[PDB]
């Protein structure tokens, strides 16, 4: 690596080159760390994690027992080994704790002061990071598998909420109105996601093997309805254009926002184009999943070749997004993995499982 | 909140882009050069270049291309700042005034997107309908131009190819056609599309994609007669047009990849190509009536390492170089007997990538003198930067024993000085200036056989001579005596100071004030001063017709400067200088209508008091030390202003810039005497004299950095000054190809003595590192010590460790092999230099690469890959570990102050590691938990740790004030705009506490200093007002330009003052100064900014 | 660097200038040492030193200066070699013999300022005309064992008087302890004895006063 240092020193290669090459090297050498720990606080499994977007310091986690821990990943100690102490926690003793499993906790974008969560108690609560008090609560008529806030929108603050009804809900964290709904799906909505690039493009995955991108400004259906064979087996859109063969329960736009990775219960990933819904035929091999709710997964940022970290049974699988190769298989858990989140700042990966653990993977050397 | 001041001593000199075209006007031929932020416009006259403007863009100029829309009389200019500010500059000259008016400006940054691997590529349609930018991978940002965009409302066109190597617009297509080379897992594939504005989306290309070489890395859109695009590569140059395909694999270009191209002919019959090695090819296209017959590549010769070259005319090719000197070469039609058609005409000095530099007080003065290791593989060299005012020596003469110089208008009719009067011990010689020819004459009336204290033209067409015996008045025609005032009691004259109409001579204790009258020396008055007179002057001041009413004197016993009114010799004022050293030369002079009495003590110390001409009241007693030997203050005129030249062992010029005197070194070993010699053959010269020679040469204008150059022809990496041995230690790193042989004679191969490191610890092209020992007078490599095979010397520090007195060169190396990614085996060699020999005193094999090292209170503090272990120098003379520290990602940079250690991690960005001596173990006082990729880090004060990250930014960590005290706080943030390679405490000048020079990769040498909070608030208000007043080149808001920017973070600049913006306050006319100071008076703030300008 | 040579070089600068000129200063140095008013005048002497520095005779001129001071300081030891004096009066004798050497050796510096700073300053081996004076005084007067003995025993004996409540010449002590410090023999010769004697007295006083 001294070659990269000298090249950067004499201005040959842009500093970008060393930065990205070193980030890729670190992610390729990713391994579990016994030189770091995250305190065990959840009675049941961990369903979700979301490192804060700005400064990458705090870290929420939605336990399956309704407790929302709020970790602190900065090594405030002096020793090489440390444990990420849990700063706060919405314990069961809290008056407004979630009665059932918390399956999505997300920071309010552009404002770390607040964060949101939602649970099978058919509620979505807007939590205040400082005083830990519900700022706003929206009660739905049915459960809430997954919700997501636009990480790019400075204009609106709508919140797609995929209930187990066929209708996507849009909740407004400004003056409350959950009236706006997006009709067109046929079964439960297991995973939604806003477009990181465009303000108003929402991609919603369902359990009927359909992935649709909605222009929420448009109030006459969806822009696109993803189709496996790119229209080869052309059929009108009444029972066709199925992005999978079984339930599709996970979405993750690539970091640039140009491609919409989807993973479904048919045991395949597919890197769909995000502008016209044309499958790009990246193989990815066979990816194992059997979960019956929102499967979380994330994609690396600031690396030469974009990696995707998909929960694969009880192991994290690391694929290269644009080539489909399998980099490795991080292997440290005791039950199925429910959510892995990438710490972009230092190329660290935190993967909550169903065994109440949150294993923090870090690079070697 | 910390407070700091960042100013640019040396403007950047790396040329990252240069274009040619008619920018100033239709018939012109400009050569724009895009130095990092400077935009140096030029005009290609028949010889050389005629610079016409130099505007500092508020941006890193990443793309520069000239385009001529339909209806424009002269080419516009498009500039894309690396922060993605796009502006269509237009030149517009209005008489003297030159203004780069901005036709249209806008920001073309997408909020989210991977910055492209190859970097920003910005291209323009040859018919000038759109400007194609490829900023982020996957997207292809197109800017329309057919509509009149006053904001450059670009629109993204999606690209289905995610890794585009290079993209160019094709020539002669009815629709704007791009022709790019992208990489997909099957290889690389040229491809084409038809951009279409109305559709805002590509279409099918005019000629479908094709396969290209595995390393096809460039595109050349050939002009209309041929069409198509050439595609250069590692080993092939494939020409494509869709149906034609002419591909060749010349053997010469296999040696080194081609990186820069340019079109010689407007029909593209011939093309230039330069490669990394520095060669300069010439691609020739043969035409058939048209089509293309065959391609040929010819090696024109060699030039600097060409980053971007252009063809101007008549073979004048400007080889703009980032690494070496931006050359300017002539393409001879025939060989130069070396097979090289290229002969370097000119050269532009370029402080290339400053890998590292050291401030040294060389020549033992009080003047800092940088020594940078600029350059790269072939252009590696040492640059020695030093302030000063150079001397263009026109004529040097051998004349030992000179003891005084004066100019004489030996002919009353002539205006210029035609005669120079030397004066030697106990005699005098007259020198006649008849053109450049100079012969000694005899001036009748001047006694040759006595020393002279003064002789010059005076009133009434007469000379004068004041020997050690008698003041003499000579009729200028026919050059015979008319009056000889002598001491009444026949004693030798001890002092004398004359002017146009007054002569005062101090014989011992007693004065005698003569007034010159036509053919009559009338002794008006006299007096008996108390103590023996030392020095005196009666220089006229104000507007008196050569009648000075004051006569400053300095006395021997009671060391004191006085001012005696004339002709009564009334003691208007007395001033005790103090000390045990007598005054030696006392001068009365004017500086921008501010009077001064510069009195110089005999020890070299100099005083200057603010003199009140009417009342003679010395105020503002200031002292400046300029040398050691006794000084001699002689006035001289330069460009309609009068300066003062302080002849000593350190010849120093004194001139007043903005009512503040400036004391500037003169680049000369010694100057005993001087005289302003305005001769016919040497108009407006200085006849500088020294012990052995007499020199003539015009002196320069106000100060500026003077850059020597010591070529090494091999890339240096580090530098250290070992004072005791009087030599620099430089870590060159040359390239070898095969055994192994050198590709060119480098300094390491041309050393007086050498030695190969025979080490038993461990048992294409490679780098064979060395440790050169450079003599610090001749700059001749005394000893070149070669390191082991496959060993990289990363660190070098000169120190004495432990208790022994010897001073050691210590190099931390790191073995490198291609198979591994991070090094594993390194060693810390301890060299000693003595008697022209370099012995290995110790050796300490380690378990990783030794990145950076710093002597720590006599204990060596290495940094093995991810650990910072503090070695100890045992009395047995082998380094012995004391304590380690492992909590790092990779410790690359170390800096120390007292016992604190600042560790610049690769990405965790700081660690204020403190050494507890009572316990013997490191203790992390604090850390900053931001992911700031570092480049170099330095310590200012106890709680100010400057750092420079790799996104072209600066930040200042301040130790705050429980566990949160372990967080270092970032208080200062400032987007410098350069990649800082090195910091080093010091300055280049003999208000701002602290001074930290820092190099860059572009050659900029900034200078960071701390400020008091009061001046910080004042200057911040000034900066905001100036932003509101000054109009920038691209209408780029300064607050945006300096906003601390990274791909993941963007914050406004704070705790930093843009030094250049403040200094621009000097160069703005008075009405706009009054605007800037609408709410303190303008002169006060001019004074403040002058006090700031003094630092660099 | 267009060198030019189109000259006629007739003259010769010095007649017998160095030998005669030094004898001018030699009287001036002799006159200054004996406090006799200088018949010649300093500017002529200073400018005379200037010219002799042009002829590169600075080394020999530096040496011949040494013989002047060397041969005067030695002339001052002999009055102190007579032991018809008590301790207190002796200290004023030697102290004046030091104050005069400072007043004189400043004067010899002023005349020879050019030689001191042009030639001697660069020649780091040689000491300045000032430190030259201290070296002469130290080795040829103060390094005298009998003078050093009866001197340090002088200063010590006054401090013991001062400790016992007497009033002593503080100014005289300040000059001598200034004199020793400038000559650098303060630490080796006087500090050890003073600390040694002081240890004794307060040690004796301590045990003496405890029971009282």
From Swiss-Prot, chain A:
Gene Ontology annotations of biological process type: DNA damage response; double-strand break repair via classical nonhomologous end joining; positive regulation of DNA repair; proteasome-mediated ubiquitin-dependent protein catabolic process; protein autoubiquitination; protein polyubiquitination; regulation of transcription-coupled nucleotide-excision repair; response to auditory stimulus
Entry-linked SMART domains: WD40 (SM00320)
Record localization: Nucleus; Chromosome; Nucleus matrix
Recorded metabolic or biological pathway in which this protein acts: Protein modification; protein ubiquitination
InterPro entries associated with the record: G-protein_beta_WD-40_rep, Rad28/ERCC8/Ckn1/ATCSA-1, WD40/YVTN_repeat-like_dom_sf, WD40_repeat_CS, WD40_repeat_dom_sf, WD40_rpt
Keyword DNA repair attributed: yes
A GO CC term assigned to this protein in UniProt: perikaryon
Coiled coil (UniProt feature): none
Pfam families named among the record's database cross-references: WD40
Described function: Substrate-recognition component of the CSA complex, a DCX (DDB1-CUL4-X-box) E3 ubiquitin-protein ligase complex, involved in transcription-coupled nucleotide excision repair (TC-NER), a process during which RNA polymerase II-blocking lesions are rapidly removed from the transcribed strand of active genes. Following recruitment to lesion-stalled RNA polymerase II (Pol II), the CSA complex mediates ubiquitination of Pol II subunit POLR2A/RPB1 at 'Lys-1268', a critical TC-NER checkpoint, governing RNA Pol II stability and initiating DNA damage excision by TFIIH recruitment.
This protein's name: DNA excision repair protein ERCC-8
Organism (species): Homo sapiens (Human)
Lineage per the UniProt record: Eukaryota, Metazoa, Chordata, Craniata, Vertebrata
Gene: ERCC8
Curated annotation (Swiss-Prot), chain B:
Region (WD repeat beta-propeller A): 13-351
Metabolic or biological pathway, per its Swiss-Prot or TrEMBL entry: Protein modification; protein ubiquitination
Main location: cytoplasm
GO MF, one example: protein-macromolecule adaptor activity
N-acetylserine: modified positions: 2
Segments for region (Interaction with CDT1 and CUL4A): 762-1096
Protein modification: Phosphorylated by ABL1. Ubiquitinated by CUL4A. Subsequently degraded by ubiquitin-dependent proteolysis.
Modified residues annotated as Phosphothreonine in this record: 1081
Annotated spans, WD repeat beta-propeller C: 704-1011
GO cellular component entries: chromosome, telomeric region; Cul4-RING E3 ubiquitin ligase complex; Cul4A-RING E3 ubiquitin ligase complex; Cul4B-RING E3 ubiquitin ligase complex; cytoplasm; extracellular exosome; extracellular space; nucleolus
Domain of life: Eukaryota
GO biological process assignments: apoptotic process; biological process involved in interaction with symbiont; cellular response to UV; DNA damage response; DNA repair; ectopic germ cell programmed cell death; epigenetic programming in the zygotic pronuclei; negative regulation of apoptotic process
Localization annotation: Cytoplasm; Nucleus
Region (Interaction with CDT1): 2-759
Cysteine pairs bridged by disulfides in the record: none
Domain comment (free text): The core of the protein consists of three WD40 beta-propeller domains.
Family: Belongs to the DDB1 family.
PANTHER family membership: DNA REPAIR/RNA PROCESSING CPSF FAMILY
Summary of the function given for this chain in its UniProt record: Protein, which is both involved in DNA repair and protein ubiquitination, as part of the UV-DDB complex and DCX (DDB1-CUL4-X-box) complexes, respectively. Core component of the UV-DDB complex (UV-damaged DNA-binding protein complex), a complex that recognizes UV-induced DNA damage and recruit proteins of the nucleotide excision repair pathway (the NER pathway) to initiate DNA repair. The UV-DDB complex preferentially binds to cyclobutane pyrimidine dimers (CPD), 6-4 photoproducts (6-4 PP), apurinic sites and short mismatches.
Disease: White-Kernohan syndrome: An autosomal dominant disorder characterized by global developmental delay, variably impaired intellectual development, hypotonia, and characteristic facial features. Some patients may have genitourinary and skeletal abnormalities.
Gene that this polypeptide is encoded by: DDB1
Curated annotation (Swiss-Prot), chain C:
Modification(s) after translation: Neddylated; required for activity of cullin-RING-based E3 ubiquitin-protein ligase complexes. Deneddylated via its interaction with the COP9 signalosome (CSN) complex. (Microbial infection) Deneddylated by Epstein-Barr virus BPLF1 leading to a S-phase-like environment that is required for efficient replication of the viral genome.
Highest taxon, organism lineage: Eukaryota
Assembly, per entry: Can self-associate. Component of multiple DCX (DDB1-CUL4-X-box) E3 ubiquitin-protein ligase complexes that seem to consist of DDB1, CUL4A or CUL4B, RBX1 and a variable substrate recognition component which seems to belong to a protein family described as DCAF (Ddb1- and Cul4-associated factor) or CDW (CUL4-DDB1-associated WD40-repeat) proteins.
Job description of the protein: Core component of multiple cullin-RING-based E3 ubiquitin-protein ligase complexes which mediate the ubiquitination of target proteins. As a scaffold protein may contribute to catalysis through positioning of the substrate and the ubiquitin-conjugating enzyme. The E3 ubiquitin-protein ligase activity of the complex is dependent on the neddylation of the cullin subunit and is inhibited by the association of the deneddylated cullin subunit with TIP120A/CAND1. The functional specificity of the E3 ubiquitin-protein ligase complex depends on the variable substrate recognition component.
Family indicated by similarity: Belongs to the cullin family.
Name of this chain's protein: Cullin-4A
Origin species: Homo sapiens (Human)
Full-sequence portion shown in this chain: 42 to 253 of 759
């Amino acid at each position: 690596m001294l070659g990269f240092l000298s090249a950067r020193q004499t201005g040959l290669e842009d500093p970008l080159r060393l930065r990205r090459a070193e980030s890729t090297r670190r992610v390729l050498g990713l391994e579990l760390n016994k030189d770091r720990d995250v305190e065990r606080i959840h009675g049941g499994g961990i369903n979700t994690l979301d490192i804060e977007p700005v400064e990458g310091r705090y870290m929420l986690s939605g336990g399956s027992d309704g407790v929302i821990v709020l970790y602190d990943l900065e090594n405030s100690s002096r020793q090489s080994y440390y444990t990420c102490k849990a700063v706060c926690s919405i314990g069961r003793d809290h008056p407004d704790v979630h009665r059932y499993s918390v399956e999505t906790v997300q920071w309010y974008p552009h404002d770390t002061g607040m964060f949101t969560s939602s649970s099978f108690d058919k509620t979505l609560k807007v939590w205040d990071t400082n005083t830990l008090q519900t700022a706003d609560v929206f009660n739905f008529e049915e459960t809430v598998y997954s919700h997501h806030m636009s990480p790019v929108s400075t204009k609106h603050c709508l919140v797609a909420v995929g209930t187990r009804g066929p209708k996507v809900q849009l909740c407004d964290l400004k003056s409350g109105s959950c009236s706006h709904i997006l009709q067109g799906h046929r079964q439960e909505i297991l995973a939604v996601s806003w477009s990181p690039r465009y303000d108003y493009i929402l991609a919603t995955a369902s359990a009927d093997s359909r992935v649709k991108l909605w222009d929420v400004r448009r109030a006459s259906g969806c822009l696109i309805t993803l189709d496996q064979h790119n229209g080869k087996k052309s059929q009108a859109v009444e029972s066709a254009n199925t992005a999978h063969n079984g339930k599709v329960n996970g979405l993750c736009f690539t970091s640039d926002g140009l491609h919409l990775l989807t993973v479904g219960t048919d045991n395949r990933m597919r890197l769909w184009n995000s502008s016209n819904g044309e499958n790009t035929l990246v193989n990815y091999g066979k990816v194992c999943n059997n979960s019956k709710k929102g499967l979380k997964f994330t994609v690396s940022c600031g690396c030469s070749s974009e990696f995707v970290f998909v929960p694969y049974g009880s192991t994290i699988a690391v694929y290269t997004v644009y080539s489909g190769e399998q980099i490795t298989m991080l292997k440290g858990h005791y039950k199925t993995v429910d959510c892995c989140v990438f710490q972009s700042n230092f190329q660290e990966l935190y993967s909550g499982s169903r065994d109440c653990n949150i294993l923090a993977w870090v690079p070697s050397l | 909140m910390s407070y700091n001041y960042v100013v640019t001593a040396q403007k950047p000199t790396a040329v990252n882009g240069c274009v040619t075209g008619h920018f100033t006007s239709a018939e012109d031929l400009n050569l724009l050069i895009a130095k990092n932020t400077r935009l140096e416009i030029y005009v290609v006259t028949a010889e050389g270049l005629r610079p016409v403007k130099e505007v500092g863009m508020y941006g890193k100029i990443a793309v520069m291309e000239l385009f001529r829309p339909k209806g424009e009389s002269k080419d516009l200019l498009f500039i894309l700042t690396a922060k993605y500010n796009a502006c269509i500059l237009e030149y517009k000259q209005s008489g003297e005034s030159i203004d780069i008016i901005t036709r249209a400006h806008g920001n073309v940054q997408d909020r989210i997107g991977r910055p492209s691997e190859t970097g920003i590529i910005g291209i323009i349609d040859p018919e000038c309908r759109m400007i194609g930018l490829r900023l982020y991978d996957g997207l292809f940002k197109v800017i329309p131009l057919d509509r009149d965009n006053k904001e450059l409302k670009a629109f993204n066109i999606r690209l289905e190819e995610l890794h585009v190597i290079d993209v160019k617009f094709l020539y002669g297509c009815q629709a704007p056609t791009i022709c790019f080379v992208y990489q997909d897992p099957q290889g690389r594939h040229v491809k084409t599309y038809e951009v279409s504005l109305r559709e805002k989306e590509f279409n099918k290309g005019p000629w479908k994609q094709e396969n290209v070489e595995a390393e096809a890395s460039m595109v050349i859109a050939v002009p209309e007669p041929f069409g198509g695009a050439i595609i250069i590569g590692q080993e092939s140059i494939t020409y494509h047009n869709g149906d034609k395909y002419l591909a060749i694999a010349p053997p010469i270009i296999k040696q080194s990849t081609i990186v820069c191209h340019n079109r010689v002919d407007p029909n593209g019959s011939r093309y230039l190509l330069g490669d990394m090695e520095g060669r300069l090819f010439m691609l020739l296209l043969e035409k058939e009536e048209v089509t293309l017959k065959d391609l040929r590549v010819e090696l024109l010769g060699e030039t600097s390492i060409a980053e971007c070259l252009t063809y101007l005319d008549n073979g004048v090719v400007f080889v703009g170089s980032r690494l070496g000197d931006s050359q300017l070469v002539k393409l001879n039609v025939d060989s130069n007997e070396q097979g090289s058609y290229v002969v370097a005409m000119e050269t532009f000095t370029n402080l290339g990538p400053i890998v590292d530099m050291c401030v040294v007080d060389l020549e033992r003065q009080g003047q800092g003198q940088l020594v940078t290791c600029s350059g790269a593989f072939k252009e590696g060299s040492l640059r020695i930067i030093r302030n000063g005012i150079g001397i263009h020596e026109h004529a040097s003469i051998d004349l030992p024993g000179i003891k005084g110089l004066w100019p004489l208008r030996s002919d009353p009719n002539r205006e210029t000085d035609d005669t120079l009067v030397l004066s030697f011990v106990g005699q005098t010689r007259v020198l006649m200036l008849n053109g450049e020819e100079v012969e000694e004459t005899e001036l009748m009336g001047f006694v040759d056989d006595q020393q002279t204290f003064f002789c010059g033209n005076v009133a009434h067409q007469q000379l004068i001579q004041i020997t050690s015996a008698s003041v003499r008045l000579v009729s200028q025609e026919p050059k015979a005596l008319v009056s000889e005032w002598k001491e009444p009691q026949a004693k030798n004259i001890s002092v004398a100071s004359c002017n146009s109409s007054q002569v005062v001579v101090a014989v011992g204790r007693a004065l005698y004030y003569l007034q010159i009258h036509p053919q009559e020396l009338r002794q008006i008055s006299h007096t008996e001063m108390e103590h023996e007179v030392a020095c005196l002057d009666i220089t006229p001041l104000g507007d008196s017709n050569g009648l000075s009413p004051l006569c400053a004197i300095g006395l021997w016993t009671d060391i004191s400067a006085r001012i005696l009114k004339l002709p009564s010799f009334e003691l208007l004022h007395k001033e005790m200088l103090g000390g045990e050293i007598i005054p030696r030369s006392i001068l009365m002079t004017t500086f921008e209508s501010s009077h001064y009495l510069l009195c110089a003590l005999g020890d070299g110390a100099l005083f200057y008091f603010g003199l009140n001409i009417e009342t003679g009241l010395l105020s503002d007693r200031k002292k400046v030390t300029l040398g050691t030997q006794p000084t001699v203050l002689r006035t001289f005129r330069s460009l309609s202003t009068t300066n003062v030249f302080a002849c000593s062992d350190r010849p120093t010029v004194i001139y007043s810039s903005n009512h503040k005197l400036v004391f500037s070194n003169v680049n000369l070993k010694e100057v005993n005497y001087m005289c302003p010699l305005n001769s016919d053959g040497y108009p407006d010269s200085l006849a500088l004299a020294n012990n052995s020679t007499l020199t003539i040469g015009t002196i320069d204008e106000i100060q500026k950095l003077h850059i020597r150059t010591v070529p090494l022809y091999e890339s240096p990496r580090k530098i250290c000054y070992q004072e005791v041995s009087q030599c620099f230690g430089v870590l060159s790193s040359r390239i070898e190809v095969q055994g192994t042989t050198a590709l060119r004679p480098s300094a390491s191969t041309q050393a007086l003595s050498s030695s190969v490191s025979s080490s038993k610890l461990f048992s294409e092209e490679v780098e064979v590192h060395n440790l050169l020992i450079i003599d610090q007078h001749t700059f001749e490599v005394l000893h070149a010590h070669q390191f082991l095979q496959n060993e990289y010397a990363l660190s070098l520090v000169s120190c004495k460790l432990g208790k022994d007195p010897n001073t050691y060169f210590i190099v931390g190396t790191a073995m490198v092999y291609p198979e591994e990614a991070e090094p594993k085996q390194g060693r810390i060699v301890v060299f000693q230099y003595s008697d022209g020999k370099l012995q290995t005193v110790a050796e300490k094999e380690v378990k990783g690469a030794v990145y950076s090292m710093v002597e720590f209170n006599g204990k060596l503090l290495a940094s093995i890959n991810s650990t910072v272990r503090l070695y100890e120098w045992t009395t047995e003379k082998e380094l012995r570990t004391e304590c380690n520290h492992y909590n790092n990602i990779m410790a690359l940079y170390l800096k120390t102050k007292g016992d604190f250690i600042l560790v610049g991690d690769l990405m965790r960005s700081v660690l204020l590691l403190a050494y507890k001596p009572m316990e013997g173990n490191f203790e992390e006082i604090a850390r900053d938990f931001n992911p700031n990729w570092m480049s170099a880090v330095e310590i200012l004060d106890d709680d100010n740790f400057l750092g420079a990250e790799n996104a072209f930014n600066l930040f200042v960590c301040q130790k705050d004030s429980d566990e949160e005290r372990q967080h270092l706080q970032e208080v200062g943030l400032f987007h410098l705009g350069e990649f800082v390679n090195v910091f080093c405490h010091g300055s280049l000048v003999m208000p701002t506490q602290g001074s930290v020079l820092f190099g860059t990769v572009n050659g900029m040498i900034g200078l960071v200093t701390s400020l008091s909070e009061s001046w910080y608030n004042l200057l911040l208000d000034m900066q905001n007002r100036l932003n509101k007043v000054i109009k920038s080149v691209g209408k780029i808001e300064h607050s945006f330009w300096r906003s601390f920017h990274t791909e993941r973070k963007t914050e406004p600049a704070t705790g930093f003052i843009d030094g250049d913006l403040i200094e621009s306050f000097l160069d703005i006319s008075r009405p706009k100064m009054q605007e800037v100071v609408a709410n303190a008076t303008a002169d006060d703030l001019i004074k403040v900014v002058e006090e700031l300008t003094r630092i660099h | 660097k267009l060198v030019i040579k189109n000259f006629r070089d007739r003259p010769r600068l010095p007649d017998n200038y160095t030998q005669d000129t030094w004898r001018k200063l030699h009287e001036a140095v002799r006159a200054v040492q004996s406090s006799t008013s200088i018949r010649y005048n300093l500017e002529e002497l200073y400018q005379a030193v200037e010219n002799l520095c042009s002829h590169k005779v600075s080394p020999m001129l530096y040496k011949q200066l040494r013989q002047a001071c060397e041969d005067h300081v030695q002339a001052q030891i002999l009055p102190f070699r007579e032991d018809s004096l008590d301790s207190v009066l002796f200290l004023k004798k030697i102290n004046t013999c030091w104050q005069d050497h400072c007043r004189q050796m400043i004067m010899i510096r002023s005349i020879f300022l050019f030689l001191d700073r042009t030639y001697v300053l660069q020649n780091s081996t040689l000491p300045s005309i000032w430190d030259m004076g201290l070296e002469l005084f130290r080795t040829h007067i103060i390094s005298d064992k009998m003078v050093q003995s009866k001197t340090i025993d002088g200063i010590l004996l006054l401090i013991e008087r001062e400790r016992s409540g007497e009033a002593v010449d503080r100014s005289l002590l300040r000059s001598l302890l200034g004199m020793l410090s400038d000559l650098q023999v303060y630490k080796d010769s006087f500090e050890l004895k003073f600390l040694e004697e002081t240890n004794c007295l307060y040690a004796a006083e301590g045990q003496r006063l405890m029971q009282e």
